[PDB]
Amino acid sequence: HGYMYIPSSRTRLGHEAGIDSCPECAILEPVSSWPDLDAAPVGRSGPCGYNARDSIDYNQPTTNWGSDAVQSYSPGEEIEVQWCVDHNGDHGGMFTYRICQDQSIVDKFLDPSYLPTNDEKQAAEDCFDAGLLPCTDVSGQECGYSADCTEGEACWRNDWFTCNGFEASDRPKCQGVDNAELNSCYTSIAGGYTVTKKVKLPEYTSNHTLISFKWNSFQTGQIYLSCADIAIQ
Ligand SMILES: OC[C@H]1O[C@H](OC[C@H]2O[C@H](O[C@H]3[C@H](O)[C@@H](O)[C@@H](O[C@H]4[C@H](O)[C@@H](O)[C@@H](O)O[C@@H]4CO)O[C@@H]3CO)[C@H](O)[C@@H](O)[C@@H]2O)[C@H](O)[C@@H](O)[C@@H]1O
Ligand SMILES: *[C@@H]1O[C@H](CO)[C@@H](O)[C@H](O)[C@H]1NC(C)=O
Ligand SMILES: [Zn+2]
Ligand SMILES: [Zn+2]
Ligand SMILES: [Zn+2]
Ligand SMILES: [Zn+2]
């Protein structure tokens, strides 16, 4: 259980607006999340997430999210990106951030009067996959391989970030990455822990585009997706 925290995602805003009772619950399942991290169709979840608890589809704006950029950046800027993991749902695994560099695709996710179809959500997901922001694009960032992967498998890739080993004696799992205090970020179930990295934004301008967060489990078949509205100017 988790969701994107910085920049503030649609899911974070849905919870802060008093709409989403369990932001960390928005999940794509059942799916094959491992070891091939991008083969599973994203279905209704799409690149922004769907929360079944309250029937909230984050792929379209409402009065509470999606209307404008939450934060503005510069092309090529190295930025802080953070997600929030629940204390009781820390799965380990691998996660990433993506930006679709096709504005006309993204526009269909910026219209409060339009709900993307599942085919449009998948075409968008494919554009996000193409627009993955690699861990390794940030000078000096350590980009390791997963303790839950072996070379030759489709999870053996350090463009994606990895959580710490599930079985590590010190600082295991995703919480171990920052080793932050409980409730350093909000979750509804048991309180949240931050998971913080940097990415290099693309050399691309938009007054309003999306960054999509994706987190895949290894032990169970589950994917968590969120997106944030940003500007790159
Ligand atoms: O308004 C929110 C919040 O802002 C500040 O705190 C931010 C953040 O601080 C801490 O996260 C740390 C990580 O723990 C630490 O590991 C490090 O992550 C680095 C890595 O070291 C690098 O290798 C590379 O990948 O980049 C990441 C990200 O820079 O630094 C981050 C902070 O950037 C803390 O654990 C989190 O809980 C915090 O959100 C203010 O201090 C805070 O008061 C305020 O609440
Ligand atoms: C953003 O909008 C302003 C109009 O307010 C315009 O001048 C500028 O070119 C736009 N930027 C992009 C990246 O489209
Ligand atoms: Zn979970
Ligand atoms: Zn479940
Ligand atoms: Zn694949
Ligand atoms: Zn286009």
From Swiss-Prot:
Binding site for Cu(2+): H1, H91, Y224
Membrane topology: Single-pass membrane protein
Residues annotated as glycosylated: N207
Principal localisation: membrane
UniProt keyword annotations, A-Z: Copper, Disulfide bond, Glycoprotein, Membrane, Metal-binding, Methylation, Transmembrane, Transmembrane helix
Subcellular location: Membrane
Cofactor: Cu(2+)
Keyword Cell cycle belongs to the record: no
Keyword Cell membrane: no
Cofactor note: Binds 1 copper ion per subunit.
One Gene Ontology cellular component: membrane
UniProt modified residues of type Methylhistidine: H1
Segments forming domain Chitin-binding type-4: 1-230
Similarity annotation: Belongs to the polysaccharide monooxygenase AA13 family.
Name by which UniProt lists this protein: Inactive AA13 family lytic polysaccharide monooxygenase
Organism, as annotated: Aspergillus oryzae (strain ATCC 42149 / RIB 40)
